Structures are given as structure tokens and as C-alpha cells.
Amino acid sequence: KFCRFTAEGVQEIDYKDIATLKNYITESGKIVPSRITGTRAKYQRQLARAIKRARYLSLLPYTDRHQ
Amino acid sequence: MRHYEIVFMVHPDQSEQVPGMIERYTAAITGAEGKIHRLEDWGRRQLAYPINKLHKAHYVLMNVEAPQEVIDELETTFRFNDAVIRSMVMRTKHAVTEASPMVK
Amino acid sequence: AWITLEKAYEDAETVTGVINGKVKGGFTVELNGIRAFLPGSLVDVRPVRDTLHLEGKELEFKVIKLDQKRNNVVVSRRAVIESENSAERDQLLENLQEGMEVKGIVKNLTDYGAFVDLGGVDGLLHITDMAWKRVKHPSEIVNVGDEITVKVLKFDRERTRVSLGLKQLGEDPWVAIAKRYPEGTKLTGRVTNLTDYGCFVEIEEGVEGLVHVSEMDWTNKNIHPSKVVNVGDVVEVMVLDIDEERRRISLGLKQCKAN
Amino acid sequence: SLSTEATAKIVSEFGRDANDTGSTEVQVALLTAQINHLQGHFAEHKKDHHSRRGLLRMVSQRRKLLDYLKRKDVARYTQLIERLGLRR
Amino acid sequence: SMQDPIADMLTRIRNGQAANKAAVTMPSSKLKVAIANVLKEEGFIEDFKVEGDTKPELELTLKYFQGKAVVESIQRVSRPGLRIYKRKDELPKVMAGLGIAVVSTSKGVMTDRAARQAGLGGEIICYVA
Amino acid sequence: PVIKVRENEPFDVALRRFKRSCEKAGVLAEVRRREFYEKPTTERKRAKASAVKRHAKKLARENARRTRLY
RNA sequence: AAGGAGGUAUUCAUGUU
RNA sequence: GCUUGAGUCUCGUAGAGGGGGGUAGAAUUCCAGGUGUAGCGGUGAAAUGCGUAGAGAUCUGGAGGAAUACCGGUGGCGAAGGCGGCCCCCUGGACGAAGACUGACGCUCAGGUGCGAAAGCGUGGGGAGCAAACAGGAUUAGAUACCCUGGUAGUCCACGCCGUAAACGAUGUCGACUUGGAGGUUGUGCCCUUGAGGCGUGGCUUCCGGAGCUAACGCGUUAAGUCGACCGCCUGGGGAGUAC
Ligand SMILES: [Mg+2]
Ligand SMILES: [Mg+2]
Ligand SMILES: [Mg+2]
Ligand SMILES: [Mg+2]
Ligand SMILES: [Mg+2]
Ligand SMILES: [Mg+2]
Ligand SMILES: [Mg+2]
Ligand SMILES: [Mg+2]
Ligand SMILES: [Mg+2]
Ligand SMILES: [Mg+2]
Ligand SMILES: [Mg+2]
Ligand SMILES: [Mg+2]
């Protein structure tokens, strides 16, 4: 599966990059499991935080149906 | 002094106040011996979910080194200035001067 | 054998290999352990409704590329097309169907336009060059391989890329509007795209005007356009200014309310 | 906790060079500064039992250090508990 | 906390013999070296040495005769929680004399047999069989 | 799971896509889990039991390849 | 609901979709 | 005296550790409207119940309380009880690298002190959902139950009580020693990072397992092997964790 953050040296995932985060949410808008994406556990936690911060700022939708 | 990433989003129909608001907040921070490290007016962006039945709001981003007290006062200004729809202040361990992904 | 497949591609080999099939990604090849990519105009050499000879049946695997990381080859039936296309596309890059004032043989529907190959060249174009409605994929006028009509605009004949336009013929709606619709006439239009800074309402075929967020309500300056009118709603707006040069309509909703 | 600059000042005052951080006097002085600081926190936060457990460790450690110092050299001990303004 | 370094040394010998190790090592002290000498002269260990200037390390090379370890049992007798002293008449006989009782007399640490001949009592460190 | 009807796509084909989309979002499993309240102890017990048996079956399988049944 | 296949499961260009 | 146990300082790292304050979205309920009309709801099947004073359904707005899907993991943090949206403020511990410093300053601990799920108690709030008691409907030979429709205290907050649980690893704390394997998680060093590689070295953790221990089950370097320090407890079953 191979983590795409360990191989890029990324320190913090960043919630302002709405291209990487879109790859890590599903169509409904929920966060995809690390078991599927092959992300490491450390970057998974960072990634989940970034997605939640983006949702608050309405860069990402919470769900597919409130819009 | 701590570092802060401040993102506030303004009403789409108060778009012309954003320059003025930027200058006031920058002046407040800089007057308290602050250090504005980044300032990116992202502009009018399509909200992902309707807020107050308001699509397409005006995003502003600001990365700042400033005392906690001045930062608290700025957050209070947000709480009362009923043109800013949302704000978020985050504490960063170091200063970021690099251009954000939203700039280009 | 993958080494030898890459070496036979270095020879411009035209081998008899098992095509990988037909797909939205063009055409796949299969040369003895080399799954080949090729685009929609380079996935096979037969221009028919079922190209399984190129991809899906033992047929032409062409020398188009060798990619280790893609496990990939030039999976398209070469040794047939582009061969006489040399002289054909020479006459094409000399003529271009009257300098792109020509018909073309369509290929498929793309995410950015609509493409008609030429046989030595291949042009594209926009979807709103033969229509005016809010479009996302304009391919609903023909199937793959039909005969469309366009006028050439930007053609790079040193790379075999073309881009014709489909508005070199149709009477301009703007010119008739300029004589038909003087400023200050009220007409009804359908909101095609809505923004916070303005809502685009299509009043006529191929004419979209921008009604500013400041022109949505005179007495509540802080009202989102998305809350007052939905995309596709028919609203009456008064034509305030017509910019023919910029192809812009400034429409005023403020005249329906009171200042 | 205690800032970098505050620790540096205290080490200079109570240690016989800038590199003397392990002296009993310096350790008691650092513990005393942090203990005195936390009083305001626990005045506002009477229900912070977890942080208060950390504070009780500090108080307990200061007593052990002072006991050692009193048994090891009584004169330094009297001087220290006078400077630091500590009873017993 | 470590509060019986003699018992620790006996434990290392016992565990090393049970795990068929060639040699065992421990931090050194003069009491450990004295006990080690008695063991070596009674033939329970093959050799011992001390290496190190500031933090000496005592190394004992253990003995096996027919594949089996030579020391069949070794137990601390006097311990910090309960000290044992015996008068010259009351010295023990480990395994009816086939074992040694390391007894720390006033003339140094020796075996039960040596102390009984010298007419001394003292503290009983360990039993060795 | 918001499925838009595609062009020329028959109803059966579109319906299969929609059913699979819902099964991918796991809606029905979620609803069945929220029908009734279960104590946190019950939830933890069930989670731990599934892990134990899943691990045991993986280990049992990975040792079954070792030996021959005939 | 019933059966089959693959695994403890994915890398499997993106794009298209 | 000494530096190896125990501590201090220097730079980082991970974390549902704690306290306070804000905020976001989904959903449940209620309220007011629009469209609409004869059922809804519930069950093994029904009935109570709600509905022509227009329910249920659907759309719009509002109020309010409580909890944070996905991530999420025999994952992490905490002495234990326990801790799960996001942001800020105050604050505790753990670990790693290299180096400097103190120089046995240690371990255990009766009595004592503090923390300690849920239920409960006092005083005042708040109350959407759920729900002892209770009311009704069924089931049944009976049904003071299981099932259904409601429903109060309570669950939430603030401040005090209470001090208890299968408060469990049914395994007291500290230290040392003794063959291995596959993993997780968090640091760090090196080599060619040739491209998620290779090679080491720390902390915590899950599962197999050897010798040895285990009535046996098992346990096994995180022991329930081998040892030492100190404390807690046990002495047939019932009476009884009861009486005084
Ligand atoms: Mg400290
Ligand atoms: Mg006690
Ligand atoms: Mg309670
Ligand atoms: Mg109460
Ligand atoms: Mg009350
Ligand atoms: Mg009930
Ligand atoms: Mg008890
Ligand atoms: Mg418990
Ligand atoms: Mg348990
Ligand atoms: Mg017990
Ligand atoms: Mg085992
Ligand atoms: Mg009693």
C-alpha cells in the first residue's frame, strides 16, 4: 500500500491543502481507514485532525447530504 | 511570543471591508511589537456547506507572532464584528512564511 | 523477454500481440508480459465500432513506448496508420481542410472538449462553440466517429495537435440582441450558475448575463444570492448595460425593488 | 512548568558556576520556584486532581532534599531555608 | 533496590549454571572476591578474575564435569533481614561434610572445615553443594 | 450515496450501482448498530472477542498449510 | 438470502469515469 | 571519599493525561407555518396509543438539551477509578540523544493523608433523549416479569456527602539474573535514501513459546523461573462479613 507521507518527508499534513485531503476522504465525505490507504498511524492521526479542521472552515463537507 | 495561524472568513457582501479589516488587525498586532509573517487574502471561495444560508464567502489567512493578550483581543473583535462569519486561531510552534496551497 | 520487448520496440517492431482491450483510457496492449497503453486515437489502427483486433484480440502492438514503472508499451495497432499519414498529414499540415475550415471525424467525449481527428492531424474544440447552455460534456450531438464541423483556430502542426472552433458560421446572437434588446428592456432569464459575487442568468440561447450580488437586493445588502434564487430559477431582470466587445450583460434586479 | 530563562537565573544564584545544576541548593531552589508558581493555578482549579498529584511529588521531593542537606551540612541548610524563605 | 549483593552473586552463579553459560560476570567488591577465592580453592568454580579500575567487574568461569554443573545447590544463609552467627561448636555440616559452608570468621572468610580446625565461629554466608 | 443516472444506462445497471454504493457507505450496518443502546462494557467485550477469534483463525490457517490431510 | 472465487491484499499510471 | 543506584540542567518527541472557556455539524424532540389525506405506530400476532381540532409523510424557520458517526486500531495516555468532535488558556507525567552537575540523597511502609465507576443523599439550576417506580395493553393456569404504549426520580450542571464494585491480570511494590520467534506503537544512530531499502540501539505494548515453575489449567525475560528488601492477607463449610 505504501504511505504517501513517509515517502515524501511531509512533517505536518496541513489542512489548507484540499488536494491531498480530498484523496483521503470518500464520496460520502467520511475519512477512509488507514487499513485501506496504507497510511502510517502517526500520519493517520495528523490527517484526521487536518480533515476535521478543514470541515470547520467549510473547505470540506461534513457529509454528502447537508449540501 | 507564540506563533498563530489566523483564518477568518467574511460575509461575501462585506468584501470591500476586507482590506480595511486587514489593516486594522495588522496594525493592532504590529503595535504590540508583533511580527506579521504571512498574509494571504484568498478571496471569495465557494463554501462547501451553506453557513447561515450564505454560499461563497471571503477567506483571509494570516500567520502571526504576537503576545497572547493581543491575540485574545483580536479573537474578541471577531466574536463581536458581525461581518466575520467564522474564525480560527491556531498555535504553531514555528513561523511559516511559505506560500499556502490556496495562493496557487 | 521484457528486455527483448523493449528492444523490439527500439526496432519499431510491428508484432502480432494480444490486445488488452478497449476502455475509456484508450486502448490496452499485451505483448508477452507487456501491457501497453495508447490513447483513444492511438489504441488501435482500425477505426470501426469494435476495435477488438487492436485491443482484445491478437493484433498490432506498436512501438510507442516502454515504461518500467507503468509496465507499459505503446499498445496501439501501428504499421497501418500514420504510415501513409506521413504524406496525408503533410497534405493536411499544408491544407488542414481549408485551414481548419473543415469537417472532422470525431473520436470521443473528453473532460475539456470534443475532438475530431484529421488523419495526419487531430483537432479539438470547446463544447460551447456549437451551443450556449451550461454544459459539462458536449458530446450529445454525435457518437464516436461521426462527422462534425469546425473552423481551425490554433493548430500546432509540428506536434500533430489541432484545435478547431465550432463558432465560425453560426449567426451571432449578440448582434441580433444589440439591435433587438436596447438597454433598459426587462426580460426573463434562467439562472445557470450562481456565485456570491454574482448570479449568471441565461436569458437567450448562448447569452449569459451577470447579476451582481449588489444588484440582488437594494434594502438588504448582506443577503447571499444562493438564498434568494436557486440555480435554474427563472427571474425577470432589466438589462442595464450590454458590453458586446466583452460579451457581457450587466443585469439589474435592483429595479424590481425600491431604493 | 518553569521557563528556560527562569531556570538559568536560579542556577546562577544558587550554584557555584553556570554549569552547577545538580547541587542540592539548586534543586531545592528550582522546586521551590515551581511550587510557589503553581499556587495560583490550584487557586483557580480546585478540581485539578491530576496536576495536584504532580505538585505533591514536588513538595515531597523538596522535603527529602532538605533532610539530606540538613544531615549532610547544617550550615548550608540554614542559609538555604533562610534565603528561600522556607520554614523548617 | 539491590540490598544483598552477595545473594545476587549466588543467584548469577545458580542461573548461569542452569543456563550452561561458560562464565558469569558481576560488579565486584572485596567480599565477593573473598567468596570467589573460597569457591575456587574448593573446586566449585574453575577460575575467577577482576577487570576494571574505577568500576571493577568480577568474572567467574563456571565448571561442568560430565555435562552437568558442578554446583548442585547454592543458597544464601545469613541475609540482611535475618543475620546468622554460630559459635565454633555449632558450625554446620553441609551434605554430611560433602559440601562447604562459607563462614566469615574474624580471621577472614573460609570454609566450615577450616574454621572448625582453627577453633572459630562467625557469620555463615552461604551453603554450597 | 448519491447516484446520478448516466446516459444510456438502463435502470437495472443504475440500480446495481446504487445498491453497491450504499453497501460501500455501510448505511444498513450503521442503522442496525444504532437501533438499541449497548453498554460500553458490552461493546468492548464484543470488540475484544472478535479480535481474539480473528487472530486465532489466522494463526490456525497459517499453520494448516504446514501439514497434509492425506 | 444462496453459491463461487481471491486474499488476510493489495502496488496495480493517472485520466477517464 | 567514589560514581554504577537516585536525582538536576540542556534539545526534542508522542499522547482520548487533568482543569477552564468557546465553537461546529449531524441527529432526536418540541413549536409555528405551507403542500397534502386517511391512516400512523407497534408486534410472533395484537391492543393500549396518536389522527378529520388534519396525524404520519414532505418542505421552511425557530427553540432547547444531551452526546461527539467516519478516523478507531488485542491503538494511545493515566497510580488506579478512567479519558474520544475542533480551537484557545492554565497545567501534570513519560520517553529519547549527547553532554554537564550533585554524590547514596535509596527501597518499603503499619498509623495517617489524598484520589477513587455507577447507584444514592443535600442544596439550588436545567431537562432533548433514555428510563427504575408507576399507569395502561398483551402473554400466561397464574405473570407483581420477559413483549408493547406512555412515564417520574435519575441520568446533565454547580457546590457538598457517600467510599463502594467481578474497583479483575481475580497476579503488592522495588531490584537483579535466566534460551527464542512473529508483530504493534513511539524515539534515535548508521549505511548507497540508489525507490516505501539495509543495518543497529532505547521505552511501552499483543500473541506464540523453551528450560524451569504450575494439583492441574497454565506461566514463561511484561513469570506464575531463579533470588533479595519491605508491607498486606489465609488457617474446613455453614452461622457470617452477621451480631455486639
Ligand atoms: Mg523535573
Ligand atoms: Mg494504610
Ligand atoms: Mg453519579
Ligand atoms: Mg442530586
Ligand atoms: Mg433538582
Ligand atoms: Mg418500558
Ligand atoms: Mg472490596
Ligand atoms: Mg474496571
Ligand atoms: Mg478487565
Ligand atoms: Mg481483591
Ligand atoms: Mg505462552
Ligand atoms: Mg456490617
Side-chain angles (χ1 to χ4, degrees), chain A, chain B, chain C residues 1-12 17 21 25-26 33 36 39-40 47 56 79 87 99 104 113-114 119-120 123 131 138 145 165 170 173 176 178 182 184 189 198 206 209 225 232 252 258, chain D, chain E, chain F:
Chain A
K1 294 163 183 168
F2 128 88
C3 185
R4 305 177 194 183
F5 306 102
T6 312
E8 273 83 344
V10 181
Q11 290 185 341
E12 285 191 10
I13 270 63
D14 197 22
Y15 65 99
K16 296 179 294 295
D17 188 8
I18 322 295
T20 304
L21 311 180
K22 279 287 279 298
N23 298 316
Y24 286 96
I25 64 167
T26 82
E27 311 93 357
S28 41
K30 15 170 78 186
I31 325 179
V32 52
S34 173
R35 175 195 63 255
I36 294 300
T37 338
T39 320
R40 285 184 30 184
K42 194 187 54 184
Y43 298 110
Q44 188 62 25
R45 297 193 297 266
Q46 297 185 8
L47 180 80
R49 283 184 222 111
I51 285 172
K52 297 172 174 179
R53 295 191 260 250
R55 287 175 179 163
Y56 170 74
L57 285 170
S58 62
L59 277 7
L60 302 170
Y62 276 89
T63 178
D64 44 355
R65 267 175 281 111
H66 68 352
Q67 201 270 175
Chain B
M1 312 208 294
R2 305 135 169 265
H3 297 81
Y4 291 101
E5 192 160 331
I6 308 176
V7 172
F8 60 98
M9 23 202 285
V10 197
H11 202 298
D13 304 304
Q14 262 64 30
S15 187
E16 33 171 0
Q17 282 63 282
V18 167
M21 298 168 174
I22 286 184
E23 311 320 310
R24 282 183 286 282
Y25 304 155
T26 294
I29 291 178
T30 318
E33 225 60 43
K35 304 288 299 300
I36 295 232
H37 298 281
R38 185 164 77 182
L39 180 47
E40 305 191 7
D41 182 16
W42 295 348
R44 213 89 59 76
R45 288 188 54 101
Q46 194 75 49
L47 294 196
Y49 53 85
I51 303 174
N52 301 131
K53 304 171 288 293
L54 288 164
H55 311 62
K56 254 303 210 56
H58 190 107
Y59 284 78
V60 188
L61 151 77
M62 191 186 315
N63 214 93
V64 152
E65 185 174 11
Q68 327 171 114
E69 33 275 4
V70 80
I71 291 300
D72 190 10
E73 184 71 13
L74 229 183
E75 172 67 292
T76 330
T77 310
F78 288 161
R79 301 291 303 285
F80 292 149
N81 180 22
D82 192 81
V84 289
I85 292 174
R86 290 218 172 124
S87 57
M88 191 168 66
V89 309
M90 298 175 53
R91 199 163 86 82
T92 315
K93 30 172 160 42
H94 309 112
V96 302
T97 6
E98 320 306 316
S100 79
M102 316 260 82
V103 92
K104 211 72 260 172
Chain C
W2 218 40
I3 290 187
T4 218
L5 285 148
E6 124 226 312
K7 292 186 286 85
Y9 147 81
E10 178 66 44
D11 301 315
Chain D
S1 51
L2 215 54
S3 174
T4 300
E5 23 273 26
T7 59
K9 172 191 299 176
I10 294 185
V11 167
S12 303
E13 299 190 36
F14 289 84
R16 41 92 251 175
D17 43 7
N19 67 78
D20 188 62
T21 61
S23 192
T24 298
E25 291 101 329
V26 173
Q27 297 192 40
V28 176
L30 295 167
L31 283 186
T32 300
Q34 184 62 223
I35 288 167
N36 284 334
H37 171 79
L38 290 182
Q39 300 313 294
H41 168 85
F42 293 115
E44 292 182 354
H45 287 136
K46 300 174 175 60
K47 296 303 185 182
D48 199 356
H49 305 292
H50 298 59
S51 313
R52 191 176 281 109
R53 176 164 187 271
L55 169 72
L56 292 181
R57 165 185 270 201
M58 265 155 35
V59 163
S60 178
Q61 197 169 1
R62 191 177 61 178
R63 183 55 51 198
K64 294 180 179 191
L65 280 178
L66 288 181
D67 292 337
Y68 170 67
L69 194 56
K70 181 176 177 63
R71 168 169 38 84
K72 219 271 184 187
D73 195 337
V74 61
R76 294 192 312 185
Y77 160 83
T78 288
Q79 201 285 320
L80 181 68
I81 74 165
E82 180 264 353
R83 200 189 299 184
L84 280 171
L86 307 170
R87 76 202 165 96
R88 185 208 154 196
Chain E
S1 280
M2 186 184 282
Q3 298 176 21
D4 206 7
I6 302 306
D8 179 68
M9 150 168 172
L10 307 197
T11 295
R12 291 176 131 104
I13 289 179
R14 212 190 292 101
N15 295 12
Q17 294 280 15
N20 297 318
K21 318 188 59 56
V24 298
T25 47
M26 58 219 73
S28 179
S29 75
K30 60 181 185 179
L31 189 49
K32 290 173 166 180
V33 173
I35 306 173
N37 190 37
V38 173
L39 290 184
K40 194 210 68 180
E41 293 193 335
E42 284 303 325
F44 284 101
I45 68 169
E46 185 74 35
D47 194 10
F48 70 95
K49 66 134 65 259
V50 287
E51 178 258 25
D53 197 359
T54 164
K55 37 181 56 193
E57 194 181 4
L58 169 66
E59 185 229 11
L60 329 175
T61 85
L62 309 162
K63 191 178 168 187
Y64 311 86
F65 177 47
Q66 287 171 85
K68 295 155 53 61
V70 165
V71 277
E72 300 169 14
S73 64
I74 171 174
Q75 46 184 347
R76 189 94 153 86
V77 172
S78 147
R79 51 188 176 92
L82 179 57
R83 304 281 184 180
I84 302 291
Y85 309 103
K86 294 290 180 177
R87 293 168 45 89
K88 173 243 311 167
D89 304 334
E90 305 184 20
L91 288 177
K93 307 234 65 173
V94 182
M95 278 190 47
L98 280 65
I100 72 157
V102 170
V103 45
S104 174
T105 65
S106 192
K107 305 282 299 304
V109 2
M110 60 184 71
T111 169
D112 50 79
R113 197 196 53 175
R116 208 177 292 103
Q117 285 167 358
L120 293 179
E123 177 165 4
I124 302 179
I125 289 178
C126 52
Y127 292 164
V128 184
Chain F
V2 181
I3 283 243
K4 182 190 195 67
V5 177
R6 300 198 292 183
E7 193 59 36
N8 306 340
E9 178 163 285
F11 182 74
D12 288 52
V13 178
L15 191 61
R16 248 78 170 180
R17 274 154 38 84
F18 171 73
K19 166 168 53 63
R20 197 229 346 271
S21 178
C22 290
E23 121 88 353
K24 191 132 300 298
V27 192
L28 300 187
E30 192 74 27
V31 183
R32 282 213 60 172
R33 194 178 57 82
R34 295 177 179 269
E35 289 171 21
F36 302 109
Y37 178 80
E38 53 160 340
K39 295 153 61 185
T41 168
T42 302
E43 184 234 38
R44 296 191 298 258
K45 178 180 66 70
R46 183 236 310 170
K48 192 200 311 170
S50 84
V52 168
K53 73 176 175 66
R54 166 179 48 189
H55 185 82
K57 290 276 194 306
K58 167 227 307 305
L59 202 62
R61 181 150 167 174
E62 237 76 25
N63 293 121
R65 66 191 82 267
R66 167 123 294 170
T67 325
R68 59 170 170 173
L69 280 185
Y70 68 77

